[PDB]
Write a protein that binds this ligand. Sequence first.
Ligand SMILES: O=P(O)(O)OC[C@H](O)[C@@H](O)[C@H](O)CO
Ligand SMILES: O=P(O)(O)OC[C@H](O)[C@@H](O)[C@H](O)CO
Ligand SMILES: [Mg+2]
Ligand SMILES: [Mg+2]
Lengths: 213, 214
Amino acid sequence: SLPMLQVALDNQTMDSAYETTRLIAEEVDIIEVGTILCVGEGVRAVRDLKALYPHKIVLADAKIADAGKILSRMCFEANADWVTVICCADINTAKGALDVAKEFNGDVQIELTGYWTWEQAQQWRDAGIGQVVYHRSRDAQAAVAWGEADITAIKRLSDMGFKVTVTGGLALEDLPLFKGIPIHVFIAGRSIRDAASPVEAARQFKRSIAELW
Amino acid sequence: SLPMLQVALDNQTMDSAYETTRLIAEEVDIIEVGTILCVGEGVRAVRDLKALYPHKIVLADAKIADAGKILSRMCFEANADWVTVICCADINTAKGALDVAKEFNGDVQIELTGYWTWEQAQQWRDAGIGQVVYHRSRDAQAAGVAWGEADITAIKRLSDMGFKVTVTGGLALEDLPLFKGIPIHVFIAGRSIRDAASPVEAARQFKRSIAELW
Ligand SMILES: O=P(O)(O)OC[C@H](O)[C@@H](O)[C@H](O)CO
Ligand SMILES: O=P(O)(O)OC[C@H](O)[C@@H](O)[C@H](O)CO
Ligand SMILES: [Mg+2]
Ligand SMILES: [Mg+2]
């Protein structure tokens, strides 16, 4: 269907996250427990947010790097729908997290950061991974803009059969760049949370997506 | 010169962690808040363990992959001494985490796993990173992956470049002699201490073996 909209809750405490969710939870498709929230509060954040918003997809952005079975199970026992595994994890970390995900009718996304290869991407498909997150680092961005090499990479991932998420300092005005590509999800963190009107911001994203797709 | 001993608290809740620390806090050098504990309990795990053991080095194994300043600050505000940044992070993620660390009289380690390069290593040294963790994955280890000459070569090369090298990942007592003659900074044991019949004796055995081999 259309690209879904995800809000990143990169907040240090639950109450800070709820300042955002109370404005926009019904304005989005996916609620992300950001890595910062995972580290701030632990998996209770996942459990609490799914209990509040059981009708939304809850993504635990844990960036699992090792111990795939243990960490995925902790997230899925807390009622996560989706979890993230970082691309530099061993392939068996990804496989282990996926095996657990399937027990809970959930899913695993590979977070694509810095160096990764097309040979790895094929490893992920062969393993039954069907989601990747094309994830521009904020620390790179604080220093890196979007460009054709990103678009080229995103199309190639999509062609390989991944459902592709696009994220990393995304702004409303960025959306037209990805026109024509079957983007699975766009994530907005700061550009929703920190807007003068978070509700207006989310609605602008959904409006633009509807228009472009 | 003796390699130090670090216990990894890869426990899901604080009370499970404390079943281990109440036995071995004074039998090891470094208390690691494992990644699994960080995700289970959040950064309160760091604050609480440092409050219990303020004389010990407390390492938060957060495996920071992005937002290096924000995540490091959270750990350091929680009274961490050291924090980990994964090697596939942007170099500015590591730099940002180091800048914060320096505000708090702390330090950052790069976790070395999977693919990385000697160019990266020079980058880390150039940024002022003085510690790396030679970090074997338990999921590869579960697939049957063992310590060999490639590991020794790499560890000696990282040491020569000026890093203090930590060795970890399913470390067993019988693995130590493989590293004899290398100036290892720290050996981490998680499961081989926590899950022993006597965690105290397991820690003590690691310490005696290290004292003999070095
Ligand atoms: O739009 P933002 O603020 O960059 O947030 C979305 C990012 O995907 C963020 O969640 C990232 O995963 C931080 O590491
Ligand atoms: O000795 P173990 O059980 O392998 O634990 C130590 C590891 O370094 C562990 O903490 C690793 O970081 C988990 O990702
Ligand atoms: Mg995120
Ligand atoms: Mg660890």
